[PDB]
Amino acid sequence: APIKVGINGFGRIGRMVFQAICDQGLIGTEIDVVAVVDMSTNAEYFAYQMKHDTVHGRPKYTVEAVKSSPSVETADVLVVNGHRIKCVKAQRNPADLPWGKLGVDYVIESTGLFTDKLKAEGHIKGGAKKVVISAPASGGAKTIVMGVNQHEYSPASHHVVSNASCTTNCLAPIVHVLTKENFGIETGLMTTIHSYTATQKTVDGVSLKDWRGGRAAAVNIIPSTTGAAKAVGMVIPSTKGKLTGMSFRVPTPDVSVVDLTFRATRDTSIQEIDKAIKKAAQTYMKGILGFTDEELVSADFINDNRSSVYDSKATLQNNLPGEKRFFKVVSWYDNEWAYSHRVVDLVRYMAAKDAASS
Amino acid sequence: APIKVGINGFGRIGRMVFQAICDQGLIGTEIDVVAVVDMSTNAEYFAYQMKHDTVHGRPKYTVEAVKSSPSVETADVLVVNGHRIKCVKAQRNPADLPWGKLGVDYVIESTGLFTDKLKAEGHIKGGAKKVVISAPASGGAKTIVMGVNQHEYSPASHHVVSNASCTTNCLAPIVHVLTKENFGIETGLMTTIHSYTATQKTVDGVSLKDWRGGRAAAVNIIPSTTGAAKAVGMVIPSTKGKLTGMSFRVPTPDVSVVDLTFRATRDTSIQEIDKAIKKAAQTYMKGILGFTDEELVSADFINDNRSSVYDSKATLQNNLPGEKRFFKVVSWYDNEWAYSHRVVDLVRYMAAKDAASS
Amino acid sequence: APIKVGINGFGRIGRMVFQAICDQGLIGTEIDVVAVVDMSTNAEYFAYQMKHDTVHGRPKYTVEAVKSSPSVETADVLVVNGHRIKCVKAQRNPADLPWGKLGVDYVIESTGLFTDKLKAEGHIKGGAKKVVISAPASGGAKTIVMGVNQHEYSPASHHVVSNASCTTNCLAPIVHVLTKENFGIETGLMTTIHSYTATQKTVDGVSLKDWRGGRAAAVNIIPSTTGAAKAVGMVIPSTKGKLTGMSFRVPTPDVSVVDLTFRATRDTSIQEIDKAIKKAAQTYMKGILGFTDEELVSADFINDNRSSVYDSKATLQNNLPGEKRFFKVVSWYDNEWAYSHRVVDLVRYMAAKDAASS
Amino acid sequence: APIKVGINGFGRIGRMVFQAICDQGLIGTEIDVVAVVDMSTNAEYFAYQMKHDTVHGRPKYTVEAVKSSPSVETADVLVVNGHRIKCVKAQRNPADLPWGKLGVDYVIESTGLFTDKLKAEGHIKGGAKKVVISAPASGGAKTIVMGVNQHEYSPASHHVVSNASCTTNCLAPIVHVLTKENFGIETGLMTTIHSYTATQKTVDGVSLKDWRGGRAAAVNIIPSTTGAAKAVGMVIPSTKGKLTGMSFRVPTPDVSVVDLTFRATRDTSIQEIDKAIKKAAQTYMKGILGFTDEELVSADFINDNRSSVYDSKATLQNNLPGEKRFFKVVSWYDNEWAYSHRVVDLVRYMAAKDAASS
Numbered sequence A, B, C, D: 001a002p003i004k005v006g007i008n009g010f011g012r013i014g015r016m017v018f019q020a021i022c023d024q025g026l027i028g029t030e031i032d033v034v035a036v037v038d039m040s041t042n043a044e045y046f047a048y049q050m051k052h053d054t055v056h057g058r059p060k061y062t063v064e065a066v067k068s069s070p071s072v073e074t075a076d077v078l079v080v081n082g083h084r085i086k087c088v089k090a091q092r093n094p095a096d097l098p099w100g101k102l103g104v105d106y107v108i109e110s111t112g113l114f115t116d117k118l119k120a121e122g123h124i125k126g127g128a129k130k131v132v133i134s135a136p137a138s139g140g141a142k143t144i145v146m147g148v149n150q151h152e153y154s155p156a157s158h159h160v161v162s163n164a165s166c167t168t169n170c171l172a173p174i175v176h177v178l179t180k181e182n183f184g185i186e187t188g189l190m191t192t193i194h195s196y197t198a199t200q201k202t203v204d205g206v207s208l209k210d211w212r213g214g215r216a217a218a219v220n221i222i223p224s225t226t227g228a229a230k231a232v233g234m235v236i237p238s239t240k241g242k243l244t245g246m247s248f249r250v251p252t253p254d255v256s257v258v259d260l261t262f263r264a265t266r267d268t269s270i271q272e273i274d275k276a277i278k279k280a281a282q283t284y285m286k287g288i289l290g291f292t293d294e295e296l297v298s299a300d301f302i303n304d305n306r307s308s309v310y311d312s313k314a315t316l317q318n319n320l321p322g323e324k325r326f327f328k329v330v331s332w333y334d335n336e337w338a339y340s341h342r343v344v345d346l347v348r349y350m351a352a353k354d355a356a357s358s
């Protein structure tokens, strides 16, 4: 049973979803990537985009750009590891995409334009059974963070699911062991020192909705907002209105770090917390939550696919010496990598439960 | 008599041309900026963008944003030192712009989208008399570099003119005094090590016309094409087919350097060349061509309004010891600031020549 | 009566303390900078460093390099605006510095090698009557943040004064009015997102005492320690053990931002806190604390000489909506420029007190 | 029969040479690394430097840090792949290093300090049989570029050998096929847009020998000099006094590119030169000279061990269309990694020739 997926928007996350599908062994055997969609249908230019990444390197798979038939002027079929993917043209409305016809059942929505559960339904109107939004979703969609609440999915009810944001996926696992191990956050504020993204600008330009976010990106520390402010309360309803935060966008191109400052419900210590987070990383959060005892800096997390990886030393040293309630917890994440692995983990969970019931 | 100008595209070059008008003492008196055009009309947002620049800092003029009538919702008039500039909404076609209505005669075309003579003429159809494309132009518009061939301008024939590009305004000064002081160039190639611009990308992205241009801009050395390649031959026909080159877009926000390598027509020396450039700096090319004897790096050329500023020490330490024909000439330039100043000098030179005749 | 000073270690803070002295209009008239001490004595090189700065531009003063005698090989005296500063060679011990000879009474200890009280007394034995260390000090030196506790300085008891770090001169204003306006801080942790410094490395290199800190500076988010972790308790005895923090060094050359997360003593609001700080900013903290109501990023604080300028918007927008105990204060600072001005303002304060008593 | 080698200066090149020895299969069987030398004897700090590199990522090999006796305070032995390397304490004179005692015959000198052939013999007085200087040398040390002139090595008389610089290793292959294939280079001039290195400064600071080299590294285009200005004439004497160049140090942490403008000795075409370089890349320069047909940028050459990998499209698109003599040739290089592999290649060659005769 090849899960038939199509990628709408072959950008940073689209191309890293694609690469997490090939690197993890699933192309053409477990998941069938039927088609990819973006502005051009020049498969040679997509191959160029895949083969050479500034931040994550050359990939291990191989890519060819072949035509479907010599009647077409430019290569339109991509051939990865002998698997053929089709380069479909970008549609302004989700519904004008031929999903049903190409036989695509699960569509990964990663353009960034269709974050509303209502516009994303246009995929299903085009023929898709399910939709995963690689972002926070507005308008009613289900937001799941793997390792914390993927089980609340239901094939029957949830058809446009959302995998939250990179920072949610990092914060929430931290929050989830704090509650489940019962330290509890009474209240919590959080900062994500975060790499710049494709929504920012090389030099000072136009950004109407966030004035600061239009400042030259690679030469300014830019205050702005994070997506995990809302979404962690959505995933864990016990933190609704207990926790919020901001974002500082600094001049690195990938990897970010969460910096959570909370107050505990019961009296505890940072040694108890560090123990429970390591334990959790080895037992029930394994693969999603990780930890590190080394003096790592940010470029040591490029290509690290844990959702979140707790920094044991930066935490243990930077807390109040005899504290029972006021705690800092530092944790890292490759915003482009681990998040792209979680999208594929979610597709496959959903396909499993969709077959499990119908 | 105030020159009635309208800036279409209030971006890096739009806003710097505006600020140059204020810093030189022309607003309201010598130059009247009737209107600016961009993706919004919210003048409180153009205020912010004028008041805070990452590279060139805070401006000396004062900016206020007020509403034209109490009927409008968001402030839509700019007021720069008690002079009113209007914030007109952007049009997909130049012909649709109310230029004759607003009373604009000269339009500075700096959107980047209308570098063709004919899409630029839509301005004259919208009620403008003359257009200055802040870029090189296709379709046959007049290309004039100030200090070299601005005298070639005719009020009768040149309605869409072009002030070439930043690199062309840096290299043609140098090429000009080499041809005029009789050293000559037999053939020559050129390289601009240049700052990234707003067409480049924060993270690897789509750029289907120059594939490399699409790669993360601030973490890479990206080879690409320079404007001064085509344009130095248009300005000096003597260099047609004898001079071409490339760009290496490197991770800095502003200022670029030209690295010219040429073979001279007669047997000379680099000290003869160094003295002639210094001479031409102090005599005929003043304010256009400049020079330095100091050990400077790119950050020192921020806000240097010279088109070309020769580096006497880098040229001299990095040429062959007793050479008569093969030489290197190095020259800096603030690609944003100086080019903007030269646009204003062109507007003013055209507007005076037009009055002197009609 | 010129306050006889000499700067030991003319680097970033040494040249910004020097430009602060000249710019405020003090050189020659109120402060006589007798000598500057560094790894060289080539006043031509020192003058290359003064005239061109990558982050703070061309200075307002003029620097000339003169020979004290034609008997010396290279220029060894700096003439800044007609005034003569001598270039004395760098000693490995403060003690062997000719202070008593040169006439120097106040020494600004900005090498960053003699931060302990006792190696700092090495200048006094050698002739200086007073010493200001541009860094937190060990061995029991008096730590003073201007505008918070300079009233505690006593000419009799305190000869080796510490002006604390740049982050404590940003964090200590805000903790001072939070206690003075009785909100009070129960416990609190802080993070500074901070620009890389002279003590960091261009490529991965050696740093034996903090491992992460030797990593490539300009391409990593390097977690580390801050100086305000100790210093804010030395200055504000109330905060002894209630507040600590950490630093994240990010890829910008200058300007940083504190991000304090505290739990107040009483029940309050962020609009209450917002008013209290702004008020304080206009009244008793005017010149130390500042605020902004604008959407500014880090490069808008280059050359802002307030110790701490509070960002009203980023705070109000990124706090929990109806919270009474758990808050986040965000505040900027130009760690090179603001600090250096406090240095010149401590010399000036201490000096007059000494002249008041003896 | 292992070659016994010691590395002095375990910095960027020392650690990359170490990693090229383990990568190429050579550690413990073909090359035995007896000792590594740097500021510390802390095996743990060395292991942290090896395992986490910002640019080249995690090494494939495994590093442990053990104590050589229960008596030593801190781990002083590395155990890379079961092979034990000693951590010898850094010395001020090469001669005071225990090479004969340890049993070291070949010494990779890579501190950046002992670049004089006389200072380098200190190693042979310390007990070593040969010295390789990972940098151009003075005082008459024989200079070799692998792939161009290592056949000029005489076991007999060449004792302290210099592997030239990274730019001579990129430049000399290109210059070598142009003279061997009989295009010739009459006079030539080059420029290398180049990543910053460890001799540079994060923020503006001290640099007495090159004034510009002290300016903040990651925020300027810094003109400077190159090592291949001297060394290529020494490897290829045909080109002494005929070829020279300069350097621009830009804000990338690794990879650099050679922009070479030369005039041929005979009428030829850029198409012809393009074929010759591809041909060479495939036959006698294989593994040393490569080429690319792709639209690559600097980051695509990280971990590319060819010494010089020619850009076919950048060279072909940026030359004069009718030219027969005056050309531009562009070739890339990962300045840390390819040079490191070549140092191992020379040590290996040298050692086999020395065995062959004695």
Ligand SMILES: NC(=O)c1ccc[n+]([C@@H]2O[C@H](COP(=O)([O-])OP(=O)(O)OC[C@H]3O[C@@H](n4cnc5c(NCc6ccccc6)ncnc54)[C@H](O)[C@@H]3O)[C@@H](O)[C@H]2O)c1
Pocket (backbone or CB within 6 Å): A008, A009, A010, A011, A012, A013, A014, A037, A038, A039, A090, A091, A092, A110, A111, A112, A113, A134, A135, A165, A166, A197, A198, A199, A335, A336, A339, B204, B205, B206
């Ligand atoms: N990078 C990270 O760290 C990260 C982490 C977690 C989550 N995410 C999230 O994933 C999403 C994508 O982010 P990213 O970083 O990959 O950004 P990106 O800009 O690299 O990727 C977006 C991609 O979508 C493409 N695209 C634009 N309009 C499209 C369209 N119809 C419209 C159309 C049709 C015709 C014409 C015009 C428009 N149809 C299909 N593709 C279109 C773009 O060309 C681009 O390749 C965002 O929501 C972001 O929040 C990013």
Ligand SMILES: NC(=O)c1ccc[n+]([C@@H]2O[C@H](COP(=O)([O-])OP(=O)(O)OC[C@H]3O[C@@H](n4cnc5c(NCc6ccccc6)ncnc54)[C@H](O)[C@@H]3O)[C@@H](O)[C@H]2O)c1
Pocket (backbone or CB within 6 Å): A204, A205, A206, B008, B009, B010, B011, B012, B013, B014, B037, B038, B039, B090, B091, B092, B110, B111, B112, B113, B134, B135, B165, B166, B197, B198, B199, B335, B336, B339
């Ligand atoms: N920066 C430098 O160093 C430099 C130096 C020399 C020369 N230049 C040249 O000047 C030009 C501008 O470069 P820049 O660096 O200022 O770039 P920039 O991107 O900062 O400026 C371009 C500006 O034009 C605006 N714009 C886009 N479409 C527009 C439109 N109709 C279209 C429309 C209408 C409605 C919807 C959609 C589209 N009408 C009016 N404004 C529009 C953008 O919002 C932006 O503010 C380029 O040709 C560049 O080569 C730059």
Ligand SMILES: NC(=O)c1ccc[n+]([C@@H]2O[C@H](COP(=O)([O-])OP(=O)(O)OC[C@H]3O[C@@H](n4cnc5c(NCc6ccccc6)ncnc54)[C@H](O)[C@@H]3O)[C@@H](O)[C@H]2O)c1
Pocket (backbone or CB within 6 Å): C008, C009, C010, C011, C012, C013, C014, C037, C038, C039, C090, C091, C092, C093, C110, C111, C112, C113, C134, C135, C165, C166, C197, C198, C199, C335, C336, C339, D204, D205, D206
């Ligand atoms: N930049 C900021 O944001 C900032 C803000 C606040 C506070 N600070 C603090 O101020 C201090 C300086 O920082 P910075 O950023 O200016 O750094 P910097 O490296 O730019 O300045 C240090 C200066 O001291 C010089 N120096 C070294 N050894 C010296 C010596 N004897 C020794 C000697 C003699 C002979 C040989 C060898 C050694 N005698 C005199 N000068 C010597 C260096 O050449 C350099 O110019 C630090 O403690 C730092 O924490 C910096």
Ligand SMILES: NC(=O)c1ccc[n+]([C@@H]2O[C@H](COP(=O)([O-])OP(=O)(O)OC[C@H]3O[C@@H](n4cnc5c(NCc6ccccc6)ncnc54)[C@H](O)[C@@H]3O)[C@@H](O)[C@H]2O)c1
Pocket (backbone or CB within 6 Å): C204, C205, C206, D008, D009, D010, D011, D012, D013, D014, D037, D038, D039, D090, D091, D092, D110, D111, D112, D113, D134, D135, D165, D166, D197, D198, D199, D335, D336, D339
């Ligand atoms: N990175 C590149 O792209 C590249 C490419 C090609 C070639 N290279 C060349 O290789 C050389 C090294 O460059 P790099 O980039 O690796 O620089 P780097 O700074 O990373 O490496 C230099 C290493 O030498 C160490 N060192 C300093 N003094 C030493 C000493 N005695 C002295 C001592 C003893 C006690 C106290 C004080 C001093 N003995 C042993 N080690 C010492 C440093 O701690 C450092 O680890 C340079 O000549 C450079 O031109 C670099």
